[PDB]
């Protein structure tokens, strides 16, 4: 009669790497790394994300007339760009401080788009409907942006322009405008009839005096002129003043902002569905509780942490030695 | 720190044992053994559980990390950003892999220590009987039923009850 | 007779966290983390810190007349701002490159304030005492800055202005100036009588040609004009030249610099005493030798290292098992 | 790596022992024991001292770290700065907590190993006498004074001096 | 007869530091840290490095006439500056965005230097050989740069200047130019005979209108005027247009680029030999396989990793206890 | 975790032993010993080799790290760059030194465990003969040639062949 002492054996096959030996076979273990993801882009915490489609961020804010379908969007969780999004600035030029504006948009959760300067009332001196380029074409016709307004003369006359706007909404207001300059002095005089001209923008902490530059240059999209774009945040209180001679692309819609952080400009083209998660990657969504993650380093939500390994099996048990 | 029990003097494992990690096998007049030891395995389960939970606890969860954008005159800032990201990624992957390797070493040594301690605990209460042989087995000079078996499995043996008969048997051998 | 072998027991109660078990009771242990601090701001290594009080850094350097009490300060260890410091630029405008100037001030240990351009001698063409605004008021009267000088006309005349200064002090010299521009052309002609004007600053590695901009804008502190401020470091050697038409805010005091690193612009409002330490936080001072610290991450001196934990007790001894 | 001595076969600690960490308790004809062992505790004190000093030495001391300032068109640089600071803070707090936990494990195992080694050192020089029983106690077949006690406490025993009398006593039992 | 069991002893003297004890003597060990380096600068992977000598990067690209010897260099592994390299811009001024150009040069592996505007043909209106300064002297005579071209009037006349160039080489082209401005209006009229002047540069994503500034300033290298320098990358396709009145320093040589990363601007003055390595420091070259390195933190190649320690001996063996 | 073998009950090392790390010394009628044990040293060589290779593998190799340039109005970016570089350098030097210290501890304990295990393996197959004395030495009650020596060195002893003669000798002593 004997009381032989022994340990437990099993028929498992999961191996665990240790220091002094590789591929050790352990009876019980536990995984610590994620691999699986559903190739979908669901809504983070109920609120659906805003898909731009074939639209750039600049194209969406300026109101590029190809980007008409998302004309009435005012709430999101995160902004999706695709690999085909190319409809930014239709008229050729440069969007000054385009990256800082993206970093400001990465903290805003909603909009309220409203009229600053009503088109039919605020401009009883100039023409407001006879100036439009053909580079930004739409179904054969020639249309301009949907948020800005071109200004032309009214019958060989151009009075000095000055217009102000106060803030009475409690929230911050994002104001865009533009400055156009033609390639030739003849085009300058034909549109504006001012050899010298300026615009000037002033609020309290923004103050600049823009003058046009006229020079011949090779054409992009069949246009030899150029146009520069600008943006400014106001505060609850302080007022903005525009004062122009012959060079103003007047604002026509603003954006009241709302805070609430943790947004993004994820660029992917995996399709959009309507489930609900707490972690979102450009490749897909993640549902887990393990402390490490392997799908993609760019995440939105409360996501597990990204490493660059392939196996993190951790042994909880004995060495499987079958006798 | 290989304690010499697992795949040492004790040769192999038991497939027939089901319940616990560490147990006995009694071979008296009636029946066979394969009975677990629910006292020493519970401490092991609690230790490993508090180990895994602590490893999960010491790591954190990253929040929204979204890439930034730069134009063609801010190359220095872009290279600086890429350097920062690559550096932190390398540091964390190093920490994770190193932690897993050292933890695996220590848990295997932990199970080895448990088996050796259980063997020593049996041998300490079986003083001069039973003539230990081979891969952790005894002999029991005196003959006893399932009650002495269950006694040894409890941790109480009352050695002076079985002393003189085992002494006579050891002498007559 | 027996030689029973045993270990030491004690009646201590200090617990130590380990991996396989929490709250283990150990006979002897040692702390490694700091918590305590005296809520005072003492002098680091003998030299007292400079408290700005109700004064901003820009207000101190320009010589804002509310900030008169620290008119004769020329030595510090670190600069203290409070939460009530708001007297910066009294006349409204923009201090260009204000943050780079703070980063330059974080390495300088002393000053020598001196006259560049003496007020009573260097300007025998213009008026030097009849130009002062009312936004920067002081005890009812109207006073300007204490380090700059406004320039007006002398009886419907404004000669072309040019003045230079060489460096003969061996140290670097920090020179400030300003450029004023009014909101209206009438104010421009009433103060200066020059439709076009410029100032120009040149040394060897600084060269700029400033022109005013005139535009209507909403008033701050009851003033519709604006003023821009500028600063330049010289070297031992090279000379600076100012050349102005109708727009100069001439310098009137400079600052010779002295090196010696490890300074700061700590912002707190805990009171100032006169003990002596080697480590200083905004919350207080630290006196220790433990390798870890928990008070505040922003430190000046040779301070222990900041982590974000609450307990780092390290066991040096046995498990306390009372029998 | 639990060596089985502390809270193992040796049950509890001694309150009455004052001087050292590891000692003896002699119970001959005159007096009682509680005498420390100043040779094995000194190595432990030196080891723990050189451990703590090394842990202090491997860490450094930070110099002046003062916050920077940015305007409202340098948001990218500000976010980059905040990211760098938060990353380094997380890395250092992880290193500190992990180091403390593993060091506590190893020092408790160190004390356990010391006690087991001291027990084995006594048993090795008491060859076949004294019939070891229970929680690390002996019996001394032969009767001896405080001199043999102090002899065992030194590490010299001269076993052939007490061999034949203890042999006769062991046989007559 | 006995079967005494024992371990191995040796007469080695190499010590290993551990936690509980210092200077432990171990029978066998292995090093993990590098110290040795040959004080030479060999060629990384066959291709020899380009040594500038007494030349700055700006001096090499502008074609400073002291830097003549490296006139025909078009291939490198990494660029070496010495501590004596001071011949940058000979005529005094400012090389705008000089650091971004260095960061662009840290990714280019070869050149093809070619004529954009041939000197004898492209300018049949102006003088092209009678304008040269004496600050950039060469063997007593007065020579200008070797890559740019000064423009003067041709007999009290200055026609409006306009010239374009298309890209037909598939690779990116690096174009440099300059804008000169004199200190006095008399010098302006004596060289150019235009009270107002401008140059203008436009391609598609670069567009600027430069105007001169005229102000008196103290002279550097015996010249009171100034000159600014500029650079632009083109693409395969888009064309550049220069349009000037009286202020152009016309380009005369371009640079076609070639990619292939991992270059550098190592600054050292250790001599250059012609061996072959895979790792290069400013102190010397490294040949090893150990995971840690101690020579210098600035490396080019596939180098071992830099730490700041002096000893990393790792024990592989027993404690040497001689009996 | 000092296992008590190296510089413990076994006093010193052997200079005359050449081949392996762990061996024997036989002292029968003809010749002397110093024969290595090529079975237990091979596992040690493989373990240490896979340890060193893993330590080399977990580290990476840095690529081209070239310093950047800044003018006199980009002081904030320059200080940020210097901070990033100094931080990463400190983190890596800390990791390297700490890894080396802990690895040295564990490898010395590994050799100690190997020696103790080999001693226990000899004692387990020499059941009641040979009366173990001093620094790991035996006596062999029965007299046997080089064949029994080589038998013990293999791991097979066939104890019932030499039982009764050794029993008679042990009794007559
Ligand atoms: C949103 O962005 C989309 C693309 O994502 C724009 O649509 C593209 O518009 C560009 C510019 O108009 C098109 O590219 C050009 O197409 C011209 C005419 O189209 C026909 O010809 C071309 C080639 O000859 C074919 O590829 C195409 O299938 C059509 O059959 C071409 O004439 C252009 O080529 C050249 O000629 C012109 C004029 O001489 C020169 O200026 C050019 O330099 C070039 O030498 C050029 O190929 C592009 O094809 C359109 N793509 C699509 C998908 O239709 C949207 O217009 C833009 N949204 C807005 C707001 O406009
Ligand atoms: C250093 O900074 C301190 C503050 O830290 C300045 O002192 C403050 O100066 C501001 C601007 O002058 C004061 O705010 C304004 O006070 C004006 C008059 O004071 C009385 O009225 C207000 C409210 O009507 C009361 O709060 C206050 O107790 C006084 O009874 C007000 O008229 C201003 O309000 C409005 O009217 C003006 C004129 O129409 C408009 O321009 C404004 O937009 C606004 O609609 C405003 O409230 C502030 O009160 C002062 N604080 C203190 C502590 O006295 C120092 O002057 C500055 N140092 C220097 C160098 O000037
Ligand atoms: C590449 O860079 C090298 C240096 O690396 C240049 O060579 C140097 O050129 C500078 C400027 O010309 C020289 O410094 C000056 O030398 C002038 C004349 O040389 C004699 O006199 C000086 C001192 O009086 C002696 O050191 C020297 O040995 C000669 O005997 C001096 O006149 C200058 O001093 C002063 O006078 C002038 C005129 O009044 C003032 O403008 C100055 O402010 C100063 O008060 C000054 O010392 C330097 O000596 C040259 N070094 C060498 C090695 O020869 C190359 O010229 C430059 N390459 C190009 C493209 O030019
Ligand atoms: C640990 O082990 C011991 C050893 O088996 C256990 O003790 C045994 O417990 C049983 C339970 O009934 C006792 O049986 C008793 O028998 C008498 C008749 O003899 C009857 O009157 C009682 O009602 C009961 O049935 C048994 O005697 C006892 N041990 C012996 C054989 O002496 C014990 O329970 C285990 N647990 C503990 C408490 O440590
Ligand atoms: C380690 O332990 C031994 C054992 O106790 C110590 O040896 C003892 O030392 C004392 C010191 O005096 C000796 O006493 C001597 O007695 C004689 C008379 O018999 C006297 O002439 C001497 O002057 C002295 O008093 C004692 O004999 C001796 N051991 C015995 C009992 O044999 C020893 O000192 C300890 N240290 C060492 C050296 O290891
Ligand atoms: C492990 O150890 C044993 C113990 O030494 C080794 O066994 C011995 O091997 C030799 C090799 O020849 C045997 O010798 C034989 O002798 C007979 C005559 O008696 C002869 O006919 C054979 O040709 C051979 O020479 C020897 O008998 C044998 N052991 C004994 C003494 O019984 C063994 O080889 C070692 N390896 C193994 C297999 O574990
Ligand atoms: C460790 O094992 C892995 C996987 O192999 C498995 O586990 C082994 C212990 C054994 O059970 C195999 O039959 C199992 O498949 C090895 O990795 C693979 O190795 C094979 C060659 O055997 C190679 O063809 C595969 O590409 C490898 N796969 C990957 C992703 O690495 C690994 O080589 C083993 N390491 C050792 C034994 O050192
Ligand atoms: C570990 O202990 C801490 C503190 O509790 C002390 O130590 C225990 C071992 C025991 O002696 C207690 O009486 C001592 O007070 C525990 O942390 C606290 O836990 C209590 C609940 O018991 C909770 O109300 C407090 O808020 C906790 N305080 C903090 C700051 O955490 C901790 O829970 C124990 N951990 C265990 C036992 O897992
Ligand atoms: C550990 O040793 C180093 C080097 O000393 C060598 O190794 C010793 C164990 C012993 O064998 C010495 O003879 C060897 O030279 C010591 O570092 C040096 O210490 C001496 C003082 O002894 C000092 O003068 C040197 O400057 C030190 N050199 C350096 C570069 O540190 C070290 O002090 C020893 N550490 C101990 C014993 O704690
Ligand atoms: C190894 O043996 C185990 C015993 O648990 C197998 O697990 C069970 O196998 C049976 C076969 O009928 C299944 O019905 C059970 O579902 C399995 N688990 C239980 C008990 O629920 C195991 O499958 C075997 N090996 C493999 C390849 O997994
Ligand atoms: C536990 O016991 C220790 C014994 O050292 C106590 O320490 C001493 O207690 C006495 C009581 O009179 C004090 O006079 C001494 O000052 C204490 N230390 C010494 C020896 O200086 C200890 O206080 C007790 N427990 C607690 C709660 O600390
Ligand atoms: C800083 O802390 C030290 C202790 O770490 C304090 O100095 C001690 O003062 C007491 C009472 O005078 C003395 O008994 C100790 O000997 C002193 N210790 C040392 C190491 O000097 C000190 O008062 C605190 N304040 C300062 C500024 O030193
Ligand atoms: C310690 O002893 C070793 C034994 O290997 C010495 O190594 C050999 O010494 C001899 C002396 O003649 C040399 O010829 C050999 O070249 C050495 N190695 C071999 C075997 O090739 C060792 O040199 C001695 N100690 C020192 C100071 O190194
Ligand atoms: C770089 O180091 C290697 C050694 O690591 C040197 O190459 C050795 O040269 C000696 C003498 O010719 C040979 O005996 C070795 O076999 C060579 N080792 C290897 C691995 O090639 C080499 O000379 C050094 N220089 C270069 C550029 O390789």
PDB file of N, CA and C in Angstrom, chain A residues 49-77:
ATOM      1  N   UNK A  49     -21.011  58.240 -37.204  1.00  0.00           N
ATOM      2  CA  UNK A  49     -19.950  59.070 -37.758  1.00  0.00           C
ATOM      3  C   UNK A  49     -20.372  59.730 -39.080  1.00  0.00           C
ATOM      4  N   UNK A  50     -19.733  60.849 -39.388  1.00  0.00           N
ATOM      5  CA  UNK A  50     -20.008  61.603 -40.608  1.00  0.00           C
ATOM      6  C   UNK A  50     -19.012  61.166 -41.687  1.00  0.00           C
ATOM      7  N   UNK A  51     -19.536  60.523 -42.722  1.00  0.00           N
ATOM      8  CA  UNK A  51     -18.719  60.111 -43.854  1.00  0.00           C
ATOM      9  C   UNK A  51     -18.734  61.216 -44.917  1.00  0.00           C
ATOM     10  N   UNK A  52     -17.550  61.713 -45.264  1.00  0.00           N
ATOM     11  CA  UNK A  52     -17.451  62.797 -46.247  1.00  0.00           C
ATOM     12  C   UNK A  52     -17.710  62.272 -47.664  1.00  0.00           C
ATOM     13  N   UNK A  53     -17.369  61.013 -47.924  1.00  0.00           N
ATOM     14  CA  UNK A  53     -17.492  60.453 -49.264  1.00  0.00           C
ATOM     15  C   UNK A  53     -16.384  60.967 -50.164  1.00  0.00           C
ATOM     16  N   UNK A  54     -16.749  61.498 -51.327  1.00  0.00           N
ATOM     17  CA  UNK A  54     -15.765  62.005 -52.284  1.00  0.00           C
ATOM     18  C   UNK A  54     -15.526  63.497 -52.036  1.00  0.00           C
ATOM     19  N   UNK A  55     -15.240  63.836 -50.785  1.00  0.00           N
ATOM     20  CA  UNK A  55     -15.157  65.225 -50.377  1.00  0.00           C
ATOM     21  C   UNK A  55     -14.006  65.408 -49.390  1.00  0.00           C
ATOM     22  N   UNK A  56     -13.292  66.509 -49.563  1.00  0.00           N
ATOM     23  CA  UNK A  56     -12.245  66.913 -48.655  1.00  0.00           C
ATOM     24  C   UNK A  56     -12.860  67.791 -47.560  1.00  0.00           C
ATOM     25  N   UNK A  57     -12.113  68.023 -46.489  1.00  0.00           N
ATOM     26  CA  UNK A  57     -12.586  68.831 -45.369  1.00  0.00           C
ATOM     27  C   UNK A  57     -12.772  70.285 -45.821  1.00  0.00           C
ATOM     28  N   UNK A  58     -11.822  70.784 -46.608  1.00  0.00           N
ATOM     29  CA  UNK A  58     -11.898  72.133 -47.175  1.00  0.00           C
ATOM     30  C   UNK A  58     -13.096  72.251 -48.125  1.00  0.00           C
ATOM     31  N   UNK A  59     -13.321  71.206 -48.921  1.00  0.00           N
ATOM     32  CA  UNK A  59     -14.469  71.157 -49.819  1.00  0.00           C
ATOM     33  C   UNK A  59     -15.791  71.137 -49.069  1.00  0.00           C
ATOM     34  N   UNK A  60     -15.811  70.514 -47.898  1.00  0.00           N
ATOM     35  CA  UNK A  60     -17.027  70.452 -47.104  1.00  0.00           C
ATOM     36  C   UNK A  60     -17.313  71.802 -46.435  1.00  0.00           C
ATOM     37  N   UNK A  61     -16.281  72.473 -45.947  1.00  0.00           N
ATOM     38  CA  UNK A  61     -16.510  73.722 -45.232  1.00  0.00           C
ATOM     39  C   UNK A  61     -16.766  74.885 -46.192  1.00  0.00           C
ATOM     40  N   UNK A  62     -16.078  74.914 -47.324  1.00  0.00           N
ATOM     41  CA  UNK A  62     -16.306  75.984 -48.288  1.00  0.00           C
ATOM     42  C   UNK A  62     -17.637  75.786 -49.017  1.00  0.00           C
ATOM     43  N   UNK A  63     -18.127  74.553 -49.066  1.00  0.00           N
ATOM     44  CA  UNK A  63     -19.379  74.279 -49.756  1.00  0.00           C
ATOM     45  C   UNK A  63     -19.165  74.134 -51.253  1.00  0.00           C
ATOM     46  N   UNK A  64     -18.229  73.256 -51.604  1.00  0.00           N
ATOM     47  CA  UNK A  64     -17.950  72.807 -52.955  1.00  0.00           C
ATOM     48  C   UNK A  64     -19.231  72.175 -53.515  1.00  0.00           C
ATOM     49  N   UNK A  65     -19.706  72.615 -54.687  1.00  0.00           N
ATOM     50  CA  UNK A  65     -21.021  72.147 -55.140  1.00  0.00           C
ATOM     51  C   UNK A  65     -21.101  70.682 -55.596  1.00  0.00           C
ATOM     52  N   UNK A  66     -19.980  69.975 -55.628  1.00  0.00           N
ATOM     53  CA  UNK A  66     -20.040  68.531 -55.806  1.00  0.00           C
ATOM     54  C   UNK A  66     -20.441  67.876 -54.480  1.00  0.00           C
ATOM     55  N   UNK A  67     -20.066  68.518 -53.377  1.00  0.00           N
ATOM     56  CA  UNK A  67     -20.319  68.005 -52.035  1.00  0.00           C
ATOM     57  C   UNK A  67     -21.650  68.545 -51.506  1.00  0.00           C
ATOM     58  N   UNK A  68     -22.723  68.283 -52.241  1.00  0.00           N
ATOM     59  CA  UNK A  68     -24.020  68.853 -51.912  1.00  0.00           C
ATOM     60  C   UNK A  68     -24.779  67.970 -50.914  1.00  0.00           C
ATOM     61  N   UNK A  69     -24.568  66.656 -51.001  1.00  0.00           N
ATOM     62  CA  UNK A  69     -25.376  65.652 -50.285  1.00  0.00           C
ATOM     63  C   UNK A  69     -25.212  65.807 -48.767  1.00  0.00           C
ATOM     64  N   UNK A  70     -24.015  66.184 -48.328  1.00  0.00           N
ATOM     65  CA  UNK A  70     -23.797  66.463 -46.912  1.00  0.00           C
ATOM     66  C   UNK A  70     -23.927  67.970 -46.633  1.00  0.00           C
ATOM     67  N   UNK A  71     -25.009  68.539 -47.148  1.00  0.00           N
ATOM     68  CA  UNK A  71     -25.290  69.958 -46.926  1.00  0.00           C
ATOM     69  C   UNK A  71     -25.941  70.177 -45.553  1.00  0.00           C
ATOM     70  N   UNK A  72     -26.604  69.156 -45.013  1.00  0.00           N
ATOM     71  CA  UNK A  72     -27.384  69.324 -43.785  1.00  0.00           C
ATOM     72  C   UNK A  72     -26.878  68.390 -42.683  1.00  0.00           C
ATOM     73  N   UNK A  73     -25.562  68.313 -42.499  1.00  0.00           N
ATOM     74  CA  UNK A  73     -24.976  67.490 -41.437  1.00  0.00           C
ATOM     75  C   UNK A  73     -24.444  68.394 -40.322  1.00  0.00           C
ATOM     76  N   UNK A  74     -24.806  68.074 -39.081  1.00  0.00           N
ATOM     77  CA  UNK A  74     -24.451  68.951 -37.962  1.00  0.00           C
ATOM     78  C   UNK A  74     -24.126  68.157 -36.688  1.00  0.00           C
ATOM     79  N   UNK A  75     -23.796  66.875 -36.801  1.00  0.00           N
ATOM     80  CA  UNK A  75     -23.481  66.063 -35.625  1.00  0.00           C
ATOM     81  C   UNK A  75     -22.676  64.842 -36.062  1.00  0.00           C
ATOM     82  N   UNK A  76     -21.649  64.500 -35.292  1.00  0.00           N
ATOM     83  CA  UNK A  76     -20.792  63.374 -35.623  1.00  0.00           C
ATOM     84  C   UNK A  76     -20.082  62.862 -34.372  1.00  0.00           C
ATOM     85  N   UNK A  77     -19.400  61.731 -34.544  1.00  0.00           N
ATOM     86  CA  UNK A  77     -18.463  61.187 -33.558  1.00  0.00           C
ATOM     87  C   UNK A  77     -17.019  61.345 -34.050  1.00  0.00           C
TER      88      UNK A  77
END
